[PDB]
Amino acid sequence: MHNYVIIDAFASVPLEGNPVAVFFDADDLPPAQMQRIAREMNLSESTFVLKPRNGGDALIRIFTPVNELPFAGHPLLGTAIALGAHTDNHRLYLETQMGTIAFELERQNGSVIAASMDQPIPTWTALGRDAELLKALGISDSTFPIEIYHNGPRHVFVGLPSIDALSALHPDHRALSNFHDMAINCFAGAGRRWRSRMFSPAYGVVEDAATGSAAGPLAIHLARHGQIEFGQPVEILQGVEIGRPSLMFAKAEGRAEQLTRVEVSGNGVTFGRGTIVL
Catalytic residue numbers, as ranges: 45
Residue 25 — left, alpha, or beta (φ > 0 → left; ψ -120 to 50 → alpha)?
A: left
Cβ neighbours of residue 35 closer than 8 Å, sequence gap 6 or more? 63, 67, 68
For 48, the 3-state DSSP assignment is strand
Q: How far is CA 172 from CA 112, 161, 166, in A?
A: 40, 20, 15
Would you give the binding string for ligand A1IAX spanning residues 134-153, x where CB under 6 A is met? ------------------xx
| Binding of residue 31 to a copy of itself (CB under 8 A) | no
Q: Does 131 bind a copy of itself (CB under 8 A)?
A: no
Select from ligand A1IAX, a copy of itself, none the partner in contact with residue 40, using the beta carbon and a kind-dependent cut-off of 5 to 8 Å: a copy of itself
Query: What are the backbone dihedrals phi and psi of residue 170, each rounded to the nearest 5 degrees, phi first?
Result: -135, 80
Pattern 222-261, a copy of itself, x by CB under 8 A: ---------------------x------------------
Query: Does 82 interact with ligand A1IAX (rule: CB under 6 A)?
Result: no
Residue 8 or 147 having the CB closest to a copy of itself:
8
Cβ-based nearer residue to ligand A1IAX, 205 or 240: 205
- Among the listed residues 229, 267, 268, 224, the one whose alpha carbon sits nearest the alpha carbon of residue 251: 229
CB-CB contact of 248 with 264 (8 Å)? yes
Residues engaged in binding ligand A1IAX (CB under 6 A): 69-72, 152-153, 203, 213
Residues engaged in binding a copy of itself (CB under 8 A): 4, 6, 8, 14-15, 19, 36-37, 40, 42-44, 174, 243, 270-278
